[PDB]
Amino acid sequence: AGTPSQVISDGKAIKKVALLGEEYVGMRPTMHVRVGDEVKKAQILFEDKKNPGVKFTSPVSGKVVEINRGAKRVLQSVVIEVAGDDQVTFDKFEANQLASLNRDAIKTQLVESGLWTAFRTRPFSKVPAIDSTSEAIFVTAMDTNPLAAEPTVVINEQSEAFVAGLDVLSALTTGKVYVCKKGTSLPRSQQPNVEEHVFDHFLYPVSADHVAWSINYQDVIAVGQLFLTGELYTQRVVSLAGPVVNKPRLVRTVMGASLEQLVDSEIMPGEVRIISGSVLSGTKATGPHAYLGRYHLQVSVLRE
């Protein structure tokens, strides 16, 4: 019902993007910008006062037009209006170098680029501490919900970036990296501490000694792109599905894309509920929240 075609095409033009404050567990923001500031791509917008060092950066260059706040001044979203192509650039390497890079050097670049936020601890589901390490980084490269985009199609376009990302993770972990996938074959890291777990909603192992980190396949592609090119890779391939979508399919877009602009001239007439993420485990994309969640790879539209 509203199932998407597993074929990638271009999404509607995006004029504004936003980072959503409340979707980061335990995050209390310290602003590094105000309305009117021109920002570059990968420029810090704010940091977490309760997770010292974690940076949240702009997916695009442009101008800060809104800092929306709700009950008790909680940060709802920082809206950026796209303009120009100025960006903060980082160190670049060759693919063969990535698996041997120093762990702290890797950390520094992920933090300053903002990509560090892609990681979440399991349990607690919050961004790891900068000075912390993990023995088991899990890569979610599968999805059971038919409304989700099949990862293999996305990854097949970004083969070298995906593998490069895995190689960075293989140096970042103190133990192993686990690629959680279906039977369908994927590009393989040549590093011996990168394993594939084939299956036939995820659960992660718990231990008093260690904590598990999780990261989705598209962020792994971003990590790979970051270290190969030295630029923040903000492309997204998201599932645009739901019974009121005229051509349910996969569309290219940008992190934090305006969802009202993304679905413009995509939906049947009548009033609808736009949802960022899965239908059952997403958030109501309305008003100040009408933007693609950091950890969402799907946009669901229903009838109200």
Within a 10 A sphere around the Cβ of 149, how many other Cβ atoms? 24
Residue in 121, 122, 188 with CA at minimum distance from that of residue 155 = 188
Using the 3D structure, point to which of 88, 104, 139 is the last residue of a domain.
Answer: 88
Pair 101, 226 in one domain: yes
Pair 169, 207 in one domain: yes
> What does DSSP say about strands 29-31 and 62-69: parallel, antiparallel, or unpaired?
unpaired
Q: CB burial class (10 A; 0-12, 13-18, 19+) of residue 46?
A: buried
Strand partners, 87: 41
- Count of residues making up the chain: 304
In three state form, how does the secondary structure of the chain look?
CCCCEEEEEECCCCCEEEEECCCCCCCCEEECCCCCCEECECCEEEEECCCCCCEEECCCCEEEEEEEECHHHCEEEEEEEECCCCECCCCCCCHHHHHHCCHHHHHHHHHHHCHHHHCEEECCCCCCCCCCCCCEEEEECCCCCCCCCCHHHHHHHCHHHHHHHHHHHHHHCCCEEEEEECCCCCCCCCCCCEEEEECCCCCCCCCCCCCEEEEEHHHHHHHHHHHHHCCCCCEEEEEEECCCECCCEEEEEECCEEHHHHCCCCECCCCEEEEECCCCCCEECCHHHCECCCCCCEEEEEEC
Pair 96, 205 in one domain: yes
Strand partners, 215: 139
Resolution in A: 2.1
- Tell me which method was used to determine the 3D structure: X-ray
Pair 84, 156 in one domain: no
**Measured at the alpha carbon of residue 44, what is the angle toward residues 127 and 215, in degrees to the nearest 5?**
30
Pair 115, 205 in one domain: yes
Pair 105, 227 in one domain: yes
Using the 3D structure, point to which of 178, 206, 231 is the last residue of a domain.
Answer: 231
Distance from C-alpha of 19 to C-alpha of 61, rounded to nearest angstrom: 13
Pair 137, 203 in one domain: yes
Pair 284, 160 in one domain: no
Pair 81, 149 in one domain: no
The parent domain of residue 251 ranges over: 1-14+232-304
How many domains is the chain partitioned into structurally?
A: 3
CA atoms within 13 A on the CB side of 34: 0
Token pair, residue 263, equals 């679905």
In three state form, how does the secondary structure of 236-264 look?
EEEEEECCCECCCEEEEEECCEEHHHHCC
Pair 282, 171 in one domain: no
Pair 4, 54 in one domain: no
Using the 3D structure, point to which of 44, 68, 88 is the last residue of a domain.
Answer: 88
